[PDB]
Amino acid sequence: SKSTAEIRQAFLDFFHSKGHQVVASSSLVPHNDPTLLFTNAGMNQFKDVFLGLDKRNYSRATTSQRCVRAGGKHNDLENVGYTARHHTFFEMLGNFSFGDYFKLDAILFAWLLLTSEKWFALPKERLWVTVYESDDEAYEIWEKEVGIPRERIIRIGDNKGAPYASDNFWQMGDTGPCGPCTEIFYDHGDHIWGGPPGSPEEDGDRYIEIWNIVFMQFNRQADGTMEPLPKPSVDTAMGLERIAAVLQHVNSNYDIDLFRTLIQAVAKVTGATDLSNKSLRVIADHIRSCAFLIADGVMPSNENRGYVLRRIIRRAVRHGNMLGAKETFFYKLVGPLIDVMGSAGEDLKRQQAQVEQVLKTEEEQFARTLERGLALLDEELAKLSGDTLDGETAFRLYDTYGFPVDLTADVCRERNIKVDEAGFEAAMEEQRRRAREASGF
Ligand SMILES: C[C@H](N)C(=O)NS(=O)(=O)OC[C@H]1O[C@@H](n2cnc3c(N)ncnc32)[C@H](O)[C@@H]1O
Secondary structure (H helix, E strand, O other), rough: OHHHHHHHHHHHHHHHHHHEEEEEEEOOOOOOOOOOOOOOOHHHHHHHHOOOOOOOOEEEEEEEEEEEEEOOOOOOOHHOOOEEOOOOOOEEEEEEEOOOOOOOHHHHHHHHHHHOOOOOOOEEEEEEEEEEEEOHHHHHHHHHHHHHHHHHEEEOOOOOOOOEEEOOOOOOOOOEEEEEEEEEEEEEEOOOOOOOOOOOOOOOOOOEEEEEEEEEEEEEEOOOOEEEEEEEEEEEEHHHHHHHHHHHHOOOHHHHHHHHHHHHHHHHOOOOOOOHHHHHHHHHHHHHHHHHHHHHOOOOOOOHHHHHHHHHHHHHHHHHHHHHOOOOOOOOHHHHHHHHHHHHHHHHHHHHHHHHHHHHHHHHHOOOHHHHHHHHHHHHHHHHOOEEOOHHHHHHHHHHOOOOOOHHHHHHHHOOOOEEEEHHHHHHHHHHHHHHHHHHO
16 A cells, blocks of 8 residues: 555645646745634645735645644644544645636535545545535536545534534634635445444544535634635545555554654654554554654743643653653654654754754653652542542642642543642632732833
């Protein structure tokens, strides 16, 4: 089968042959978008093009964009290790139309690449599509132009409990370009639990969302109002790891060539032997987000972007502790990561030494309190009455041991214990009041 690198290149070659300008991945950190924590989509760097504020010499483009979804509008951190399809760091294979082609040709391009004998040649019968309920045009295209049997065309409304809150209406964030979308799903088979989109078991890993095609129509405002974009446009993204799983005839993203090699490296540095352990997958994912974030300029801190990075690093180190790592290990994964990322890791390779030192320093710093904090958490859980850890304890782990509350919740989750978030926040607010009282005016 094709490697992840070959699949990335094949996608770009396809759209290039269809007249799309190949544009390099942007950084994970925007310089000119205050509404954006980390790059969470291929379209981010073209946001102003969609808004009609920026013009390019090309009207159609294709990228393989590195994305991190660990905060803001799109945050999958808590899904990592619990599904076979969610990462913090991942690549979007995208094509874009800036007032060029629209609905029909976007769908045809995607179907052709996916199903043509000349290209990816996926079995058509295992492909399902969803459309926004009101998008009669998209429904007709799949049914009559493409020829998907009606039983595999699913209409999805505002299933998230609010106007425009839908799996088939994509939004960059609370503000920004948005519009109705159509998604392509692949059925991995009855050996995997799950039902098709729209069904009660849709959240299973059986029917995987591979490719989302957005018909950009509006610019959302802070108040929630939709203002029409100057030109209806197209924003698409196929998950590289997810299509790689399909093409390499495996079911989990973590079973693709990239992750198989990376997980082996994690086992090597932690001393783990059970290659099926959940923590190995978590660490493999976390090194990708952490290493690339540092390469793109993020430094660990206790505020904003730096704190999200610190939280992910420390959670990764914690998982290494559960696997029984005897020494500093996380920074040792930068090399192996560069080795599996191909051309998509060039920015990381350029700064390998710097990234390694940052991760080494951060792990050593956290090691000063990690085992001691875990010992306290064990002590408190052993005598805990009920299914919820008190907020005072979560706060003490935060204040004394530097345990972010989500790191503490992560450990407790593994033992079917919840954390009193309201209690933690109350404790944090009490401390802020003490600081204000002591500092004065
Ligand atoms: C196209 C639109 N701008 C967009 O971002 N759509 S999307 O949110 O659905 O993401 C595009 C694709 O990336 C993949 N993807 C999204 N989140 C992911 C995650 N947390 N981990 C791995 N892949 C993800 C899925 O294949 C998804 O269809």
